[PDB]
Design a protein around this nucleic acid. Structure first.
Length: 191
RNA sequence: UUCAGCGUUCUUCGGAAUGUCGCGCAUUGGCA
């Protein structure tokens, strides 16, 4: 907490308000805070050789927004993660609580990276297509599953991604990861 | 040689929205 933490966070736009196994508080750029939070969980397990788990709450706030409010709201997110599924992290919203491995791979690697590479390659697609997909996923109507499939056929995205998105939407866990992965990509792509 | 029309098609195939923004600013916070 006091020494290795400086090397783990090295190179990231993060300021550590306080440290320690009792309570850890860091304020940083959101993409950096998430990536370093994942690095920390992997390091903690390695350092402890397992048998030790860390629960965290991650929140996204405008810079002008008050620190006390940031601290209070993020405390609640940490509490969500702590009460059940203590290893799992809570990110941005109460609705999104994810295991650290889930957040790192089943969301930021299996879903966000394909979508990211697909969008960049496609000259025919854009944030607006990703917003359309998100609106269907958010509504959660059975018809939207069908409407997403019509959008996917029109979209012409690579078939394996098309099928993977379709499968993800039908599975409840995959869709929350798909929603989060799309939202993370939109936050990253947005200027 | 006269007397008559009769039957069959009644719309078809594509394209079914797309791209762009997806809140910003002030107070507050932060730095001094």
């Amino acid at each position: 907490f006091k020494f290795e933490l400086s090397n783990i966070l090295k190179g990231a736009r993060i300021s550590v308000i306080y440290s320690g196994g009792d309570d850890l508080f860091l304020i940083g750029a959101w993409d950096d805070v998430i990536s370093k939070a994942l690095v920390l969980r992997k390091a903690f397990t390695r350092f402890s050789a397992g048998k030790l788990t860390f629960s965290a709450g991650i929140g996204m706030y405008p810079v002008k927004y008050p620190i006390s409010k940031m601290a209070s709201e993020t405390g609640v997110l940490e509490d969500l993660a702590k009460r059940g599924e203590k290893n799992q992290v809570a990110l941005w919203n109460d609705s999104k609580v994810f295991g650290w491995s889930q957040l790192e791979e089943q969301i930021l690697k299996e879903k966000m990276i394909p979508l990211q590479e697909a969008l960049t390659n496609s000259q025919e697609h854009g944030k607006s297509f990703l917003y359309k997909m998100l609106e269907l996923l958010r509504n959660e109507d059975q018809i939207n599953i069908a409407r997403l499939a019509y959008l996917l056929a029109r979209s012409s995205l690579s078939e394996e991604l098309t099928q993977s998105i379709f499968a993800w939407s039908q599975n409840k866990q995959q869709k929350v990861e798909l929603i989060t992965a799309i939202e993370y990509l939109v936050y990253q792509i947005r200027e």
